[PDB]
Amino acid sequence: TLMSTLAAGIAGTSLFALGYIIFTLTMLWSGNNLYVMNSTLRSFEHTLKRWNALLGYTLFTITMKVCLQIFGCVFLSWFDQSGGWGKTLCIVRQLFSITCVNNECHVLKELEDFSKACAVETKEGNIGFDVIALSFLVFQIRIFHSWYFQHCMVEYRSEVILANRGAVLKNQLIEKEMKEQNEQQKAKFNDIRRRTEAIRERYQKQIERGAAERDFEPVTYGHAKRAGDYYMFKYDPEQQKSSATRLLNAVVNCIGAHTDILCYFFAIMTQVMTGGLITLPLPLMSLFWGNLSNPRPSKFFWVTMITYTECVIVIKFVCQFAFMPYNSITWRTEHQMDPMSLDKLFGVSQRDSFALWDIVLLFSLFFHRYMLRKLGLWKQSGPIGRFIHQLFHPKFRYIRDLYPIMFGIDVICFLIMTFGYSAFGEKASRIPVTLVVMLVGMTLAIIIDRALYLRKSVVGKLIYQVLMIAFLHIWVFLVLPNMTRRSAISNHVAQALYVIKSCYFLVSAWQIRNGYPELCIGNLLTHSYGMTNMIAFKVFMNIPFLFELRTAIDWTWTDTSMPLFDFFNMENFYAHIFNIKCARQFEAAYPAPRGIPKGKLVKYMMGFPIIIGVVIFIFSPLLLWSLLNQIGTISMPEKVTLRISIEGYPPLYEMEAQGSNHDNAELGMIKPDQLASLNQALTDSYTTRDTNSILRSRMSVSYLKGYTYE
Amino acid sequence: FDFFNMENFYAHIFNIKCARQFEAAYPAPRGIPKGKLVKYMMGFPIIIGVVIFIFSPLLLWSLLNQIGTISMPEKVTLRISIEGYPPLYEMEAQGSNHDNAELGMIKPDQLASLNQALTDSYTTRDTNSILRSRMSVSYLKGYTYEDILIVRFRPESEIYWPISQDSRNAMIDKLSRNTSVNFEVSLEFTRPYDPNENAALKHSKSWLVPISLDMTIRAKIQSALRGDPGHPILIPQSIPAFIQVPNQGELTLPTSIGNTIINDGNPRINTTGMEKSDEARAWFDSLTLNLEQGKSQNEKMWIATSEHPGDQNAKLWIKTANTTYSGRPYLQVVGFIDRAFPSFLAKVFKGGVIAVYLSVILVVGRGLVRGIFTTSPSTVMFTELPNADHLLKICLDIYLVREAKDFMLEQDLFAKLIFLFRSPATLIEWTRMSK
Amino acid sequence: SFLAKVFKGGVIAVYLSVILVVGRGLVRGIFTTSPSTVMFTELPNADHLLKICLDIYLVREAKDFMLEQDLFAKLIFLFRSPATLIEWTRMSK
């Protein structure tokens, strides 16, 4: 209901709309505190009175709009005054949205210039969002007098106060989870140390038994690497809890747990569809101070987000008004090429599309606030020093490797950036230097991200992440619109790139908060042996200039005792061995009988694809050549001229006569009868003997008949 | 072929032995990792070089796919005539020194007034006019005031009408039948020579104006062409006041401004029933041609006056200053000149440049790096020999036998080498370091 | 339209050349294994080799390098002496 009324208020441009915003902010500001009967001081009756007041105000404004319809369709002629008083009433007409929406009415043919002075768009005197908000709020009033809402209060009253105990029990549960993960980690460390000791003992006993042929103790790295011999291989190789509601329960639990990241995601979306300086502070402050907060963001963060969001909604709404000049048609159309223009720079415009994103931002923010209140978690060196200390010393933490996730996200943004390269430049659809240097910067960002992951530098990742957010924001919002001469609203592909990079920022901030997992990681792709892993690794290797990139980055950025080329040799060995093992496992998963030939069907649909593909590959260059080597055509010559003269002297007699409409008496096309007569005369131009005339008639008629009468 | 096989064997064995000796000269400790400094200045070179190799084709393309520029057209000419007959009224007037009263660049005040008139050309409702104003102002504001030239042809004829009396009689009798002939309106924009392209860029457009088959109009045209005063040649919707001069094409009509003129001025043009190619010219001006004999018929001269369609007093039009020498309005043709040309347009861009880039990346990778850079699992059996001193001794012994003019032992020793390279167990037993 | 780009036989020549290069580079390589590759691409059970390589990876990631070079030498010898490769690849028992 509050979402509907806030959407109705933000959609409209009038003081009635401002009433909607103020009323809904007073309502949602108190949250569920006014849905109780505490202290027996007429609390719930006051709630009903306030809701009935909202009802009465919505009906007041619906009546005012209906009565102003006629005031704007026939009583608008009092608005055609001179300046001053007329100017003031023209402005109040603008700010009450006094216009005509019943389009069947005749236009005021003596009053167009006045409408040019104060231009009010038609789709504002209507109601729409107003009537749907009325629907939702009258339904809510009906709910407020139902038996169900009594149990709703029962769930609220004397149970939201149990939030203090809820916080304690949640703290105990998460501390138990911390103990469980700690014991799991020490068990894993014990397992790793045991395996390493077993390998060392096996090597020592093997060399102990092989000391008979051990005739060279290595002194350098090369001798150790090259001391392979038979003595190291002389040993034997050793409606209920059912599944129907599982998805619903999982989604509800995940949403309840991740309200915070959902709120930052909606902040990013609101930012990217409302690019402007009045909107940047939300994602900036989030990603900088509340997102990367190692514990939960404090109450101050959430309350300052609430306050800044409400005031930015207010200022945006007052910016949708018409008395200001940039919202007029003339200014908007005089200033739509430049994206640095003041209205677009600040982030305010006509916004014909209904901007519903900041409403859901406010409501997700208040929703997370409500969950914090429900759980009870809502309540030296300075605050910055304490922030840094708690960030780098996690009293509460989880462990999980999210590098594959962020690698996926930034590979996707790279792909959409190189594919959507057209909109990053800009007739003149030609590749710019900015594009290639942007790809350079993105590749270097991927490289440094992998470097920080491999070195497990928490501070390095944090500083790189902060600078990357700063860069992304300032570039996308000031330089890209300036360079490409395209507004951030009309930069949809860059908008998607910004959203993807902000999701990467979200996951990177999560990783920084939870710390780099020091547990052994691996190649992140050969953990399991299967057909999907087979295809992924095969295409990763087949893609050129990607495998050795990853290997060189690893070798330079991890700690190892073996050189560059030897490291690539080992990586190639691992790739080959993993491919072989995955092939063995795949063949085991789909075994084939022994002695029975492959079925004719499998051959069939394995043989037609390869043969047809290879043949069409053979004959596709010829195919494209034939489809590209086509015959052209020219229309008949338009103008023809003649010039008789004596050499180096004026045209003694010059002609020019044209007109290809087939009706001209000068440049006329050949008539079929004349062509037939000419052909007959050419054919009957030979002699009886003298076969030279025979061959001449051959050539002449062959030449003539090759050209049609067109 | 066996000799090349032996030479390749010697090359491989010498390379292996030299690698062993080089590693011995600069040994590395066992159990201590490579120092971070060595990793640093061995890793930045390779990574930076490979990345710049990846993005160097794009770098050179960007530095080679730059935007060109042309100066403003130098000379412009106009030609009014009847189809297949001499220029009935021909103009040519130029001079790009910014001081010319004929070919002058657009003044900032005039451009501002024109832009304001275009912007205030919409209606309250009828959002079609909204979108038309969108497109028209977007089109206009894309060209600066350096790219718009005010072309002002004189009304009085450039040359006396050079038509023979017999050919003029042919004109008269052709315009006295059912045969339909077209008025010719030719305006040619000629650019100054550019040495890079080395082509005299001349832009010309022809606007054939059909003559109504009404005998009354044809009779008036006939009488005017004969020489009878008082009858003016009327040419409906012939010359456009606004021209776009592109880099290499015809004079493209400002179709958005054309639509604005057609269906945004208060005298809306009744363009309901018109042929498609004709309604695109519905916003053109209408010249009026008046022959001026003065003295004897040898001195035929034509004067042209243009009347704007719809409302002549509309603010969208640019005012024509009268002649400072005779007292007649100039013929104004506003030019919207383009400056960019494609240097190579990605060599007739069809996706091949991207295709050839990916193909060359594929081939260079799979030919150089995967080969010389990651040893095959079969090569390790021969490129990782601990001590190749025995193999080098065998090969040098073969060389000494050959150079000692002895060949009884050469084949046997070569067979020894072949078996050594053929049985890996013997290679293992024949490569162990020292003891 | 293009007259085979000033037809001199090059278009046929470049067609045959690209056919040659694409064939001998892609199909003969990734499509028919060399007689030397069968010694390494037709191992019955590579579980032991994968165990060795994963053990090397675990040693490296455990901040230990005393055993890394020795195990890499073991792998090099395994790939260097085909008899040991035969004895170190047999399936299960």
UniProtKB/Swiss-Prot annotation, chain A:
Purpose: Pore-forming subunit of a mechanosensitive non-specific cation channel. Generates currents characterized by a linear current-voltage relationship. Plays a role in reproduction by positively regulating inter-tissue signaling to promote oocyte maturation, ovulation and fertilization, and sperm navigation from and to the spermatheca. May play a role in regulating cytosolic and endoplasmic reticulum calcium ion release.
Expression across tissues: Expressed in the pharyngeal-intestinal and spermathecal-uterine valves and in multiple reproductive tissues including the germline, somatic oviduct, and spermatheca. During reproduction, it is expressed in sheath cells, sperm, both spermathecal valves and the spermathecal bag cells.
Cytoplasmic topology ranges: 38-58, 321-351, 483-491
Native organism: Caenorhabditis elegans
Top-level division of the source organism's lineage: Eukaryota
Positions in coiled-coil regions: none
Glycosylation sites: N291
Similarity annotation: Belongs to the PIEZO (TC 1.A.75) family.
Protein name: Piezo-type mechanosensitive ion channel component 1
Outcome, altering M655R: Does not cause significant conformational changes the last cytoplasmic domain
Record's miscellaneous remark: Piezo comes from the Greek 'piesi' meaning pressure.
Knockout consequences: Reduced brood size due to defects in ovulation with incomplete constriction of the sheath cells impairing oocyte transit, an accumulation of ooplasm in the uterus as a result of 'crushed' oocytes, caused by incomplete opening of the spermathecal-uterine valve, which in wild-type allows the fertilized oocyte to be expelled into the uterus, and sperm navigation defects.
Compartment(s) of residence: Cell membrane
Swiss-Prot record, chain C:
Ranges facing Extracellular side: 23-93
Traits of the deletion mutant: Reduced brood size due to defects in ovulation with incomplete constriction of the sheath cells impairing oocyte transit, an accumulation of ooplasm in the uterus as a result of 'crushed' oocytes, caused by incomplete opening of the spermathecal-uterine valve, which in wild-type allows the fertilized oocyte to be expelled into the uterus, and sperm navigation defects.
Organ and tissue specificity: Expressed in the pharyngeal-intestinal and spermathecal-uterine valves and in multiple reproductive tissues including the germline, somatic oviduct, and spermatheca. During reproduction, it is expressed in sheath cells, sperm, both spermathecal valves and the spermathecal bag cells.
Subcellular location: Cell membrane
Entry's transmembrane regions: 2-22
Effect of R60P: Reduces brood size and ovulation rates, and there is an accumulation of ooplasmic uterine masses
Other remarks on this protein: Piezo comes from the Greek 'piesi' meaning pressure.
Primary role: Pore-forming subunit of a mechanosensitive non-specific cation channel. Generates currents characterized by a linear current-voltage relationship. Plays a role in reproduction by positively regulating inter-tissue signaling to promote oocyte maturation, ovulation and fertilization, and sperm navigation from and to the spermatheca. May play a role in regulating cytosolic and endoplasmic reticulum calcium ion release.
Family affiliation: Belongs to the PIEZO (TC 1.A.75) family.
Record protein name field: Piezo-type mechanosensitive ion channel component 1
UniProt organism field: Caenorhabditis elegans
Organism placement in taxonomy: Eukaryota, Metazoa, Ecdysozoa, Nematoda, Chromadorea
Gene expressing this chain: pezo-1
